Amino acid sequence: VKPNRKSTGDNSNVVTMIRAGSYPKVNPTPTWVRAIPFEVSVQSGIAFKVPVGSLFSANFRTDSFTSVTVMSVRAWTQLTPPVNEYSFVRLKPLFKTGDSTEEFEGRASNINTRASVGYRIPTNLRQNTVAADNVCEVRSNCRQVALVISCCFN
Amino acid sequence: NRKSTGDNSNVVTMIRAGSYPKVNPTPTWVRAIPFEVSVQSGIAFKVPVGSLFSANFRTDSFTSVTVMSVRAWTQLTPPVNEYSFVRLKPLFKTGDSTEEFEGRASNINTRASVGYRIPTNLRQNTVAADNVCEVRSNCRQVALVISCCFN
Amino acid sequence: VKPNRKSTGDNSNVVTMIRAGSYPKVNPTPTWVRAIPFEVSVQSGIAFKVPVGSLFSANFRTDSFTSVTVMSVRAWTQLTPPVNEYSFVRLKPLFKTGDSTEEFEGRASNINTRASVGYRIPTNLRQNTVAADNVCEVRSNCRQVALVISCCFN
Amino acid sequence: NRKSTGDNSNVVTMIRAGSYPKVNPTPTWVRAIPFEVSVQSGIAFKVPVGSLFSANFRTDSFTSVTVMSVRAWTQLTPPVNEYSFVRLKPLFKTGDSTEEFEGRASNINTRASVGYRIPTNLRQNTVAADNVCEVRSNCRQVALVISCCFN
Amino acid sequence: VKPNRKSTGDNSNVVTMIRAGSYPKVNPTPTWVRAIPFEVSVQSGIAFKVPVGSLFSANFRTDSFTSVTVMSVRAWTQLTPPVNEYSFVRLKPLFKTGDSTEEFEGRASNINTRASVGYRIPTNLRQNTVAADNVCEVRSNCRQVALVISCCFN
Amino acid sequence: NRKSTGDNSNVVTMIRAGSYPKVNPTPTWVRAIPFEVSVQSGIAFKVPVGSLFSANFRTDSFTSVTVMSVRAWTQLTPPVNEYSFVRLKPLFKTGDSTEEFEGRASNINTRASVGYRIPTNLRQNTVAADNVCEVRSNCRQVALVISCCFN
Amino acid sequence: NRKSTGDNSNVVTMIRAGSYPKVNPTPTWVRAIPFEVSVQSGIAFKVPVGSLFSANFRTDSFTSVTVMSVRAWTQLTPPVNEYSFVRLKPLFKTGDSTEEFEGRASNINTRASVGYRIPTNLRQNTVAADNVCEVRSNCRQVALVISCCFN
Amino acid sequence: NRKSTGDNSNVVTMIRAGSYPKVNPTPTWVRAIPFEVSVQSGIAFKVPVGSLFSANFRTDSFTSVTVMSVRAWTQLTPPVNEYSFVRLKPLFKTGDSTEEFEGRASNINTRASVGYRIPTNLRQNTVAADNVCEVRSNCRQVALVISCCFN
Amino acid sequence: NRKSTGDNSNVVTMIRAGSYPKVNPTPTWVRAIPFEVSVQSGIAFKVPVGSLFSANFRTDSFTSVTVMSVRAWTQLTPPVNEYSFVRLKPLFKTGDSTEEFEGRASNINTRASVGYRIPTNLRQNTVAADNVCEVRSNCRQVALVISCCFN
Ligand SMILES: [Br-]
Ligand SMILES: [Br-]
Ligand SMILES: [Br-]
Ligand SMILES: [Br-]
Ligand SMILES: [Br-]
Ligand SMILES: [Br-]
Ligand SMILES: [Br-]
Ligand SMILES: [Br-]
Ligand SMILES: [Br-]
Ligand SMILES: [Br-]
Ligand SMILES: [Br-]
Ligand SMILES: [Br-]
Ligand SMILES: [Br-]
Ligand SMILES: [Br-]
Ligand SMILES: [Br-]
Ligand SMILES: [Br-]
Ligand SMILES: [Br-]
Ligand SMILES: [Br-]
Ligand SMILES: [Br-]
Ligand SMILES: [Br-]
Ligand SMILES: [Br-]
Ligand SMILES: [Br-]
Ligand SMILES: [Br-]
Ligand SMILES: [Br-]
Ligand SMILES: [Br-]
Ligand SMILES: [Br-]
Ligand SMILES: [Br-]
Ligand SMILES: [Br-]
Ligand SMILES: [Br-]
Ligand SMILES: [Br-]
Ligand SMILES: [Br-]
Ligand SMILES: [Br-]
Ligand SMILES: [Br-]
Ligand SMILES: [Br-]
Ligand SMILES: [Br-]
Ligand SMILES: [Br-]
Ligand SMILES: [Br-]
Ligand SMILES: [Br-]
Ligand SMILES: [Br-]
Ligand SMILES: [Br-]
Ligand SMILES: [Br-]
Ligand SMILES: [Br-]
Ligand SMILES: [Br-]
Ligand SMILES: [Br-]
Ligand SMILES: [Br-]
Ligand SMILES: [Br-]
Ligand SMILES: [Br-]
Ligand SMILES: [Br-]
Ligand SMILES: [Br-]
Ligand SMILES: [Br-]
Ligand SMILES: [Br-]
Ligand SMILES: [Br-]
Ligand SMILES: [Br-]
Ligand SMILES: [Br-]
Ligand SMILES: [Br-]
Ligand SMILES: [Br-]
Ligand SMILES: [Br-]
Ligand SMILES: [Br-]
Ligand SMILES: [Br-]
Ligand SMILES: [Br-]
Ligand SMILES: [Br-]
Ligand SMILES: [Br-]
Ligand SMILES: [Br-]
Ligand SMILES: [Br-]
Ligand SMILES: [Br-]
Ligand SMILES: [Br-]
Ligand SMILES: [Br-]
Ligand SMILES: [Br-]
Ligand SMILES: [Br-]
Ligand SMILES: [Br-]
Ligand SMILES: [Br-]
Ligand SMILES: [Br-]
Ligand SMILES: [Br-]
Ligand SMILES: [Br-]
Ligand SMILES: [Br-]
Ligand SMILES: [Br-]
Ligand SMILES: [Br-]
Ligand SMILES: [Br-]
Ligand SMILES: [Br-]
Ligand SMILES: [Br-]
Ligand SMILES: [Br-]
Ligand SMILES: [Br-]
Ligand SMILES: [Br-]
Ligand SMILES: [Br-]
Ligand SMILES: [Br-]
Ligand SMILES: [Br-]
Ligand SMILES: [Br-]
Ligand SMILES: [Br-]
Ligand SMILES: [Br-]
Ligand SMILES: [Br-]
Ligand SMILES: [Br-]
Ligand SMILES: [Br-]
Ligand SMILES: [Br-]
Ligand SMILES: [Br-]
Ligand SMILES: [Br-]
Ligand SMILES: [Br-]
Ligand SMILES: [Br-]
Ligand SMILES: [Br-]
Ligand SMILES: [Br-]
Ligand SMILES: [Br-]
Ligand SMILES: [Br-]
Ligand SMILES: [Br-]
Ligand SMILES: [Br-]
Ligand SMILES: [Ca+2]
Ligand SMILES: [Ca+2]
Ligand SMILES: [Ca+2]
Ligand SMILES: [Mg+2]
Ligand SMILES: [Mg+2]
Ligand SMILES: [Mg+2]
Ligand SMILES: [Mg+2]
Ligand SMILES: [Mg+2]
Ligand SMILES: [Mg+2]
Ligand SMILES: [Mg+2]
Ligand SMILES: [Mg+2]
Ligand SMILES: [Mg+2]
């Protein structure tokens, strides 16, 4: 059928016609895979529950989502540790179907450096969580902790 | 930087994370936005870029977007005894176009469809006040699907 | 051991003996993978929640099941659209662990034709749902919508 | 007609469905039904096809079934000093059979087992009023497993 | 760098130095994959609900876990059947998201032998369960039933 | 003995189990236990095996453990103007060792690290009353990671 | 080209027969005949060949038979404390044998079995009046399976 | 070496031009010109070539044109009960043709289309006064697409 | 054939020794000896070889030693504002050297390190009274590691 006509082709500098056909399947409000960096405050000796509602905010463009499937969690000490000590952080995953008892701990080897640790959620436990829910318990000698949660907004 | 999929893992597994990586809380996003614009008979309508920024598309947190290509479809029936048709005239801040990319329907009961691509060199940002393209048609509304890149 | 005896062999027209052994593991009430076509009524501008209890009925032979793992959902406009308009349908999946916000929309390109759309549930979200639960919200300019839900009865 | 498995998808994904397919709300079903029938000493019992239709097997919504093959096992101990045994005589509407497929136990503490296949040419439907096969045995009950096709 | 020094090498009979580096990521309370054999009592004609709390006990070393992801379930008749009968056992899986209706039955071919049966949980249904929850309903002519549950403690 | 993974199964599936297998309700367990021990200046401390048995490590149900290898790290800052250091002296019931596996830090702001392996021939059990190794250091505490096998 | 059978017909076709063939309304027939015989403790029982001519076996229309092999199993439990056993002494019209082919059960609850082949050169017909073999055993009944040629 | 364009520049470079070339401010141009023409029922309409010279097409600066091919579609619905149809009779200054290249729609709601190629040896210029072809049809309007060479 | 060791023994075996060999109760020994030496600011310290003969190193039974290489690290923090540094001037009984092999830390919190090899032809014994090298540095203490041959 005289193969192709159109205008120019590939390496071009002008508008070119698109020979559309049938109206396609669309979606104005799709899903989105994201890594949300945010900080949380932590006292000494007390485990802070990281709420899922912190992922939902306009500071991440996600204030339009009402549910999230968490995949992995990573956390860095945000501040310096007490005098003479090396930073440290722990993570206990929490699941609406059953809270786990792990304390995935990572320590720093230099006092001036951040302590880092993180955990992966298996596929059979990636389920939606709402703002009211909590993702995990954080502990640390440091007063603030920076997280980077890899999750799927839908 | 040690993550896997397809694995047989049915429990949590520790990730040996190290240095705080480079992050971004407001990343960009390539989208194919759908929305409809009403039109009149024989009168052109300037589609304002400001319809791509809205909470109905999760984009009310953006102010500037790089349009890439437009595709238009008629949304309502055409006048009596007429076949549907729609025309697209690109519009750019640096100098409007005089093209009228027209597509007609070969069955009155069908939508008319057309689109145009914006070459790489003309892919600059546009804000809400700017325009995208003129849309003529004999059909009282028109449905668009604009592939773009929010930033 | 004189290989095989029996009667005839393969291309046969008479009863043939079966040299059974130990009573096997059985199951009088097994699982079943199905695609259940049913219609639902839809008003204009109002999202109708498709109840899971509609899959459970004797019209599908499934009135003997009390739970179902939904996999995918597909929907067609069952009636004609308003005057001058083209049919359209939307689907917002619902999950007991967290309702999603997608509006998977599919439109027709001919007024006389059905509009079609559908979505797939990932593996990590295939979990049982009971009659009381709902699968998704349907919207459309058409008054009835025909669905075909692929699911696993157990 | 675009569905996958094993995928790394952890969110819903749109399916580009088109024409309303061919459907069936009451499809067929191949089954291996288990049930037990009591028996007497030296007296044959005509297993009625109507035991395969019941809500205990999810089949009370069927009326006709294509039997394919029968397999029998004794369900209770045999008389004292005896070894278990069971006989199967096929029964068809078009003309009963005189076979007596017999299987015996070589250990008194074991079940006797036997079965028969129905060739393709004799695989017609049967309703509740019809019979399947005569079952003789010295054991007070008998357990069956009938591979069939409900329709 | 003069490749390796150390002491002896591989086939050795004395302590050897380990040239450690940075403090690693640790975990004092990890997960554990286990197969927990325990018995349950069963009446005649009555289905007994196997509680998840039976997996949590110091007799399995697991009295330190508060959640469990069940994978598969296997069960053997623990005692002899009534007079003149052959042992038998059934299993109906139970899920907090929706109880199933299967009756996976396995029978013995010798009266003096155990009847055995079991079922596998798909990946999409491996979710945590707490002590309060139940795994499945057991039936049998025998008064006791021995199970061996393959599960993942976390 | 018929179990699979990676399968497309989304419903329960029957397992054809047979004979009651060999079981064990209290199996063994290889572990890498972490804990910290305080230390003084110039004085050695005998790490008691009894710190590996505790509910904080899920091991309070064990009484005997086969140590395999020790690795030590300083847990607090060193004295002023000093670099961190730690020494490990293996201890065995059959005859203590006189080695002093020492590791120092090349940056005052860094931990000192060292470890030792126990050869196969010296891998016997140890109970709570036994000792593991002497730990010297200029740092007020020390953090250990003992690979072992509980039984 | 199809699913089942496929091209076959599926309706009748004509056969172009020729000359009238050779026929036989009363052919031979090779069988495995099952039947039991009572046995006294410490007495040998002469099995009659006329037990092979019976309508139970569809063979009441035969008067002769060519015996190939004799297999025997114990049919009832043995005396207390005793394991089952059975012996077979072959008998021929041309000269009786003296072998006592015996077999014993290793489990009191199991059948004792044995059998013997008759060689080609001893395979002649035997009428109802004849005897095939002598049976000795501690169980009262003994089941037999005889592969033979009815003619 | 990069992502988009890569090595290019990205800023201007100098061209080392030479002698002043041959130029043409007013070149030729090959086009596909779209336009409609009203048609009466049962009357043939002579299409004027001067419909190809218009600013709507950027061609008001041309006075001649070399026509290659003529394609026609029906633009309005047909009378009731009737299927659309259109006929094209070519016209040439050297001798008018007599072919009525016709086309019919198979669906009343669809356009009837047809067209004809003009061979090389009949491809001469045609001024506005000339005619290209006669159009007959049952629909009142008929849209045309003409591939031609403006010069 | 097994898991660990496997075939070995696992119990003692006999050795079929022969003539009485050549023995040496007091062999040589190659070592890396660690020890520190105090250093004054702006003064060179003569390291005595008699620091290599000590029971801390199991070498109190030696009287001579053949030095191969000398490596040095700073043991205490440098003055304020200053980066660590250390210099090594070799010394030999046949003629002292004049090289000041120096090394500097690039980070104030890090050790300054340097070392020098002694070539074969200068590797003779050295008694306790002798000196191995002169040390200069801004830190007060300086740790040494010397690869040498005790004999
Ligand atoms: Br271009
Ligand atoms: Br398109
Ligand atoms: Br599409
Ligand atoms: Br989508
Ligand atoms: Br991100
Ligand atoms: Br990241
Ligand atoms: Br605090
Ligand atoms: Br703490
Ligand atoms: Br702080
Ligand atoms: Br919580
Ligand atoms: Br603290
Ligand atoms: Br790696
Ligand atoms: Br696992
Ligand atoms: Br990382
Ligand atoms: Br990075
Ligand atoms: Br990344
Ligand atoms: Br980014
Ligand atoms: Br994107
Ligand atoms: Br999109
Ligand atoms: Br609107
Ligand atoms: Br118009
Ligand atoms: Br607007
Ligand atoms: Br610009
Ligand atoms: Br046959
Ligand atoms: Br079988
Ligand atoms: Br089986
Ligand atoms: Br099953
Ligand atoms: Br279906
Ligand atoms: Br389907
Ligand atoms: Br309505
Ligand atoms: Br609406
Ligand atoms: Br309607
Ligand atoms: Br809901
Ligand atoms: Br509406
Ligand atoms: Br495809
Ligand atoms: Br995903
Ligand atoms: Br489809
Ligand atoms: Br289809
Ligand atoms: Br299908
Ligand atoms: Br079907
Ligand atoms: Br089936
Ligand atoms: Br079945
Ligand atoms: Br019954
Ligand atoms: Br009987
Ligand atoms: Br009955
Ligand atoms: Br029939
Ligand atoms: Br060694
Ligand atoms: Br290490
Ligand atoms: Br690590
Ligand atoms: Br771990
Ligand atoms: Br285990
Ligand atoms: Br096991
Ligand atoms: Br009871
Ligand atoms: Br029961
Ligand atoms: Br009992
Ligand atoms: Br999964
Ligand atoms: Br329950
Ligand atoms: Br019972
Ligand atoms: Br296998
Ligand atoms: Br499945
Ligand atoms: Br098993
Ligand atoms: Br085993
Ligand atoms: Br195992
Ligand atoms: Br074990
Ligand atoms: Br282990
Ligand atoms: Br561990
Ligand atoms: Br402590
Ligand atoms: Br010290
Ligand atoms: Br202690
Ligand atoms: Br020992
Ligand atoms: Br023929
Ligand atoms: Br013939
Ligand atoms: Br014959
Ligand atoms: Br034959
Ligand atoms: Br036979
Ligand atoms: Br007797
Ligand atoms: Br006797
Ligand atoms: Br006797
Ligand atoms: Br007789
Ligand atoms: Br004789
Ligand atoms: Br012969
Ligand atoms: Br150039
Ligand atoms: Br030039
Ligand atoms: Br030119
Ligand atoms: Br051109
Ligand atoms: Br053109
Ligand atoms: Br007219
Ligand atoms: Br007309
Ligand atoms: Br006409
Ligand atoms: Br004109
Ligand atoms: Br003319
Ligand atoms: Br020409
Ligand atoms: Br030797
Ligand atoms: Br020797
Ligand atoms: Br020597
Ligand atoms: Br040596
Ligand atoms: Br050494
Ligand atoms: Br000084
Ligand atoms: Br100084
Ligand atoms: Br100096
Ligand atoms: Br000295
Ligand atoms: Br000298
Ligand atoms: Br030399
Ligand atoms: Ca938003
Ligand atoms: Ca039913
Ligand atoms: Ca414990
Ligand atoms: Mg570090
Ligand atoms: Mg339209
Ligand atoms: Mg369409
Ligand atoms: Mg029986
Ligand atoms: Mg058995
Ligand atoms: Mg330290
Ligand atoms: Mg017997
Ligand atoms: Mg027309
Ligand atoms: Mg220094």
Curated annotation (Swiss-Prot), chains B, D, F, G, H, I:
Main location: virion
Sorted UniProt keywords: Capsid protein, Virion
An MF annotation (GO) of this entry: structural molecule activity
Coiled-coil regions, chain positions: none
Subcellular locations according to the entry: Virion
Gene3D superfamilies: Satellite virus coat domain
Annotated GO CC locations: viral capsid
InterPro entries to which the protein is assigned, alphabetical: Satellite_virus_coat_sf
Something else known: This virus depends on tobacco mosaic virus for its replication.
Name recorded for this polypeptide: Coat protein
Organism name: Satellite tobacco mosaic virus (STMV)
